[PDB]
């Protein structure tokens, strides 16, 4: 048995597997300790697992690609929710009320001709 | 632009072998300052600026549909209004309305 989930954020794309077992976390075929451990709050890799209070009951495996190092971790937040909704049926509503199951399209869309950044029009003054 | 200017459009390229091919080896050194003396070739120094109006210094690829030297699409050889005019007939092969 393995739970599965994916996540997308500003050119970053993640996929995550979770098993019932001893408390480990591994990433990109390597050890997590080799480039994670300096992130100022690490909420995006903790807060869904803190809501289900699992501590060390789940074994995690991650793969991530694309974009900047902050959005790579923000994309993993959706993977560690979609791979976690399968852990117990009575927790499906709790992760949803916590705002972790919802997504948004606020990251910028295709350019509208000729508007420089698609949301502002040229200025004027006088009559 | 006039049809009389469309005859000048060909007179401006008529000197290619007459002034712009037989002294091209001189044209590569005629203004180089890494050379002896202050004068060495005055009898040939003017021969490639002696021709006027029909010079490479006035040569421009021009709109092939109006004779205008400016404001035209070099991939079609013609201006915005004649791309628009052909697109209303669907007449340019592989060209289709889309903004991606």
């Amino acid at each position: 048995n393995q739970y599965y989930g994916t996540g997308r954020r500003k050119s970053s794309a993640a996929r995550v597997f979770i098993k019932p077992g001893n408390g480990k976390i591994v990433i990109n075929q390597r050890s997590l300790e080799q480039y994670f451990g300096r992130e100022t709050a690490r909420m995006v890799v903790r807060q869904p697992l803190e809501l289900v209070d699992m501590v060390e009951k789940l074994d995690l495996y991650i793969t991530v690609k694309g974009g900047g190092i902050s959005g790579q971790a923000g994309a993993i937040r959706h993977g560690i929710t979609r791979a976690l909704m399968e852990y117990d049926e009575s927790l499906r509503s709790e992760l949803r009320k916590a705002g972790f199951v919802t997504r948004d399209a606020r990251q910028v869309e295709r350019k509208k001709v000729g508007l420089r950044k698609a949301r502002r029009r040229p200025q004027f003054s006088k009559r | 632009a006039k049809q009389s200017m469309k005859a000048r459009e060909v007179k401006r390229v008529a000197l290619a072998d007459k002034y712009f091919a037989k002294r091209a080896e001189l044209k590569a050194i005629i203004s180089d300052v890494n050379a002896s003396d202050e004068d060495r070739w005055n009898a040939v120094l003017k021969l490639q600026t002696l021709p006027r109006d029909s010079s490479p210094s006035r040569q421009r690829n021009r709109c092939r549909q109006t004779g205008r030297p400016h404001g035209f699409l070099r991939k079609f050889g013609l201006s915005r209004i004649k791309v628009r005019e052909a697109a209303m007939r669907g007449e340019i092969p592989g060209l289709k309305k889309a903004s991606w």
Binding site: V113, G114 | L73, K75, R80, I81, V83, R84, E85, A87, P93, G94, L95, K96, K97, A98, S99, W100
Partner: protein
Amino acid sequence: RIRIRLKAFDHRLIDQATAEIVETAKRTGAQVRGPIPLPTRKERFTVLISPHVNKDARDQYEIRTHLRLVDIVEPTEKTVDALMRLDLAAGVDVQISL
């Protein structure tokens, strides 16, 4: 090996040019590389939408070029001599090398 290039602007014409050298080969039991369309080229244009005075209103147009190589290991007079004679299909550029 003998090598060919099939290039067109239309996405069904490029496959009609493929059919005369790939189906004619599969229908003789000839060895094939299989269906590979290759990445597509495209280029964009912005064109002013008035004929007169208005310089700010404009519209956009696309031109897309498909290029297939098909691969040949069993060339025939029904393929490598026939694609250079194709009259029933307009708007395609065929090029070949020995």
